[PDB]
Amino acid sequence: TTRRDHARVVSRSLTGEKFTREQASRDPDNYFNIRMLSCPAAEMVDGSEVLYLEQAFWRTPQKPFRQRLYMVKPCPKELKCDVEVSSYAIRDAEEYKNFCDRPKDQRPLPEEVIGDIGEHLTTIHLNCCDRGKRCLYEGSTSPGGFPNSWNGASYCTSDLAVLKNNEIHLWDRGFDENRNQVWGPKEGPYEFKPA
Amino acid sequence: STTRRDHARVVSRSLTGEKFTREQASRDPDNYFNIRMLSCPAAEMVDGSEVLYLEQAFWRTPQKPFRQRLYMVKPCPKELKCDVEVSSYAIRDAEEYKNFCDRPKDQRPLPEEVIGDIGEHLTTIHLNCCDRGKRCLYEGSTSPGGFPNSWNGASYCTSDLAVLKNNEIHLWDRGFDENRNQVWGPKEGPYEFKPA
């Protein structure tokens, strides 16, 4: 097991169809039932896999409220992490709506997916969890950045936990210039489990 | 002989009070949730502006508002060619003002600190009197191009506000990315707030 083995498990864990329905019925005050549908979209020459990931309210699965292109690749050996997960905005999101259930001929091809990658939103450095912990891999967006690199604008924070049987715990939060949470769940991560 | 200040006080009175989208959510649960809106006068300014505190909460968690605003309702300046000007502002420390409208005036931030705790100017809407036979009393949008916003990958935000009779409020807040994909807010239409 090296970092590309880890990345392949992380990449497989992130794809598929998932629901937060167990968490939604457990705690309806704080969590909704969200459907996550993820599929591989392109392979980089470096070996990095580009996955399409989208999230929708369970009652409107063809109207996703979040659409992303994820890049999962093994961490460089000089970087002290196992797997790197990066999410990107999509230049036009509507050509990509429900990308996972449309045949390859009538959806963006691997040729175009590299060009449709928009602004970089998150980078998460995952590490193998300790012995006995429930997770397989866990990590967050870096608590710190380069000095004077924050432009004073909105910033998002993302925590990611990969568990057994392709269970994904995702906590995407957004903040304003005065550090007040504005979007994303307040209590904790959404727990996505295979249908 | 009804002035612009008259229309602003009409708009102000219809914005205050406790409101819910529960009929719209019961009608269309696929696309709309039951959201509680509680608004009350926050401060009255010397130029004649009315400052309202307005929060929005998921009906299951009314004590955890997901959106807290300070709304300024005033008549449009004479050069602008509109009836009422409504502008929304972020709040300095949102948790300071958490559920501000049920706390009595002694134990909530005073009008002086309220205008002092005003944050970044988010939206500005120019409402106009609707014609007879229309369902609104006042309606307006953010002028094209919207206003800057940075949430979820957005680059700007739009807001549509319609004041209906008997303090019914239609509010549509949306965020769009740089390439004009909607990135937050409802996609199908405005939230319909009816008084409790």
From Swiss-Prot, chain A:
Any one cellular component term from GO for this entry? plastid
Keywords (A to Z) from UniProt: Cell cycle, Cell division, Chloroplast, Developmental protein, Lyase, Membrane, Plant defense, Plastid, Plastid outer membrane, Transmembrane, Transmembrane helix
Compartment list:
Plastid, Chloroplast outer membrane
Classify the protein's membrane topology as the record does. Answer: Single-pass membrane protein
Query: Which top EC class applies here?
Result: lyase
Null-mutant phenotype, please?
A: Abnormal organ morphology (e.g. pale green, reduced stature, crumpled and irregular margins in leaves and floral organs, and shorter roots) due to altered pattern of cell division and differentiation. Impaired plastid division leading to enlarged chloroplasts and the formation of cells lacking plastids. Reduced susceptibility to viral infection by cabbage leaf curl virus (CaLCuV).
Molecular function terms, GO-annotated? lyase activity
DNA damage is among the record's keywords: no
Q: What is its EC number?
A: 4.-.-.-
Inducers of expression? Transient strong induction in response to cabbage leaf curl virus (CaLCuV) infection at an early stage.
Tissue localization of expression is: Mostly expressed in shoot apices, to a lower extent, in leaves, inflorescence stems, buds and cotyledons, and, at low levels, in roots and siliques.
Any one GO BP annotation for this protein: cellular response to virus
Similarity field: Belongs to the CpcT/CpeT biliprotein lyase family.
Protein task: Covalently attaches a chromophore to Cys residue(s) of phycobiliproteins. Required for plastid division, and involved in cell differentiation and regulation of the cell division plane. Maintenance of plastid homeostasis controls plant preconditioning to stress and stress acclimation. Confers sensitivity to cabbage leaf curl virus (CaLCuV), probably by supporting viral movement.
Stated name of the protein:
Chromophore lyase CRL, chloroplastic
Species assigned in the record:
Arabidopsis thaliana (Mouse-ear cress)
Q: Which residues of the full protein are shown?
A: 43 to 237 of 269
